[PDB]
Structure 1
Amino acid sequence: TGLLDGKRILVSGIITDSSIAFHIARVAQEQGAQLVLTGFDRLRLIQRITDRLPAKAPLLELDVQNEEHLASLAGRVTEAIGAGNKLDGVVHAIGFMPQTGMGINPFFDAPYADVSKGIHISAYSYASMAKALLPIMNPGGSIVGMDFDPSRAMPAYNWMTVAKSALESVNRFVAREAGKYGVRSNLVAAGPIRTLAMSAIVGGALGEEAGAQIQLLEEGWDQRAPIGWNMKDATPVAKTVCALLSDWLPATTGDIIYADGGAHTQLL
């Protein structure tokens, strides 16, 4: 019962319970949504994490680079939600960039093969997912992906920033396609969230200066966010995704909502 009551919503992107997609799933369920989850490699792992969601959700394997996964995905989803039932909501919370595309590995040293894979998973998959899923979405539906504002360059994020810029562009095109279905497509630009991966990088897994830069990045974010930014709390982000999954932003599409504390609106 609540914001998303009665809505059926596929949430990709759970890998640990500190995944942003975990909290989107959690908040969505608290808000009445019925979910279908997708999970990339470690399905036993993800099933076990998602057990802690306030409700059961069928989990489906989706490797966004796997053409057959995508080819089969809408059938598997209507299996999970039942025939004559369509999705109202799709959450893309998938992202990856090989280590060479990030951190201390010099920007120019990331091999295109690595960059392409990251763009595949992080950008192009937003379109793949919309292609697989728009056929099984209701008018009034809503696709949401997870963005990290790439409008300016920053240390360490390197090719993942480039991947996010591609994503923003994809999302504008997905909006165009989604529009034919009465469906909105939008990104949520989140502030830095202390995801397991993020904590690794902060603690030096991608090099000390990268880890140092990201820590400075985090602190500056909260400093300039007029409402502050708490990187340890994904809930404001999860709620924002739910905001877009709902009927309360019905004239917004091709767009980016900044759940970033307002940090992007402030220079210092």
Structure 2
Amino acid sequence: GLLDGKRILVSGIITDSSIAFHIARVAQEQGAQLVLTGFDRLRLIQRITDRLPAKAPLLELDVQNEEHLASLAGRVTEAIGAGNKLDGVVHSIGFMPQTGMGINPFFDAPYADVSKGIHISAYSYASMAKALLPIMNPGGSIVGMDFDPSRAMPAYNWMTVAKSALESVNRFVAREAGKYGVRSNLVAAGPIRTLAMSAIVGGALGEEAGAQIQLLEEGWDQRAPIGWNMKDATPVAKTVCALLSDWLPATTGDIIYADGGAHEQLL
């Protein structure tokens, strides 16, 4: 197994279409022992994760909660056993209030809303590294989920801005993590049909935004030399696992693109 013997914390599961659900599944398939964290709806998350190939402890983590973050390392240690540390950490957490996305004008997002989204989507990558690095082994790996923000695009609006901050945060986390012998990287994924993504295509954030995201997805598959299947999160789960393994040991502060090769092609 690719991750035999590794202890890995996976955040961000909320449904069975969550990217983190598939990261967790593939990780277990490859021999990893997991600890999960979940936000708010813990009964739902437990029920969802019962479907994973192996059992895994579920800890509550609201990334905006200082107390949750302060106690996290202790709770993880309790879950995996004193004297054991984590080898891997997956950050698969993102959020932006509706005012910062969709057909709501870019200029009309109130800073308080933008700031909440940047807190959850970018700052929390640093918050989690701070909480967990003291309990990680040398050779460890921290991975977060990215959506390539190097160009602006319709609809994504302030979430794209938050991803830009996240990529910058990642390079700083790499500096800190390096002192523990730990890597920090992002996986920039193509669009994936999660429940939220489907809602948006279905017009949940405005018809115009729905149409733009649908077009975005179609152009993505078209220019990807090996195609892109927005209904299949497995290729991104495998990529996250590659970064958690020992097979990219000299890569840190970096971004790995699991996007079908769309970002390197113009037409």
1:56 is paired with a residue whose SS is coil
The runs of at least 4 aligned residues of structure 1 exceeding 3 Å deviation read none
Cα distance per residue 1:232-256 (max 9 Å; x no partner): 0000000000000000000000000
Give the Å deviation of 1:59.
0.5
Give the Å deviation of 1:161.
0.2
1:139 is paired with a residue whose SS is strand
Query: 2:143: which partner in 1?
Result: 144
For residues 132 and 197 of structure 1, what CA distance do their matches in structure 2 show? 28
2:256 is paired with a residue whose SS is strand
Whether 1:14 aligns to 2:24 is: no
Give the Å deviation of 1:118.
0.2
Give the Å deviation of 1:22.
0.1
Give the Å deviation of 1:19.
0.1
1:138 is paired with a residue whose SS is strand
2:255 is paired with a residue whose SS is strand
Give the Å deviation of 1:148.
0.1
1:204 is paired with a residue whose SS is coil
Cα distance per residue 1:118-143 (max 9 Å; x no partner): 00000000000000000000000000
TM-score (norm 1): 0.99
Give the Å deviation of 1:219.
0.3
Cα distance per residue 1:69-121 (max 9 Å; x no partner): 00000000000000000000000000000000000110000000000000000
Give % identity.
Answer: 99
Gaps of 5+ in 1: none
2:237 is paired with a residue whose SS is helix
For residues 178 and 226 of structure 1, what CA distance do their matches in structure 2 show? 35
2:266 is paired with a residue whose SS is coil
2:184 is paired with a residue whose SS is strand
For residues 40 and 239 of structure 2, what CA distance do their matches in structure 1 show? 27
Cα distance per residue 1:19-40 (max 9 Å; x no partner): 0000000000000000000000
2:193 is paired with a residue whose SS is coil
Cα distance per residue 1:35-83 (max 9 Å; x no partner): 0000001000000000000000000000000000000000000000000
For residues 69 and 103 of structure 2, what CA distance do their matches in structure 1 show? 34
TM-score (norm 2): 1.00
For residues 148 and 23 of structure 2, what CA distance do their matches in structure 1 show? 19
**Alignment length, in residue pairs?**
267
For residues 97 and 84 of structure 2, what CA distance do their matches in structure 1 show? 37
For residues 154 and 240 of structure 1, what CA distance do their matches in structure 2 show? 25
1:95 is paired with a residue whose SS is coil
For residues 185 and 166 of structure 2, what CA distance do their matches in structure 1 show? 10
Equivalent residues in 2 for 1:225-236, closer than 5 Å: 225-236=224-235
Give the Å deviation of 1:149.
0.2
2:141 is paired with a residue whose SS is strand
Gaps of 5+ in 2: none
Equivalent residues in 2 for 1:112-131, closer than 5 Å: 112-131=111-130
Q: CA RMSD in A?
A: 0.3
Query: 2:103: which partner in 1?
Result: 104
For residues 45 and 194 of structure 2, what CA distance do their matches in structure 1 show? 15
1:41 is paired with a residue whose SS is coil
Cα distance per residue 1:164-186 (max 9 Å; x no partner): 00000000000000000000000
For residues 160 and 4 of structure 1, what CA distance do their matches in structure 2 show? 32
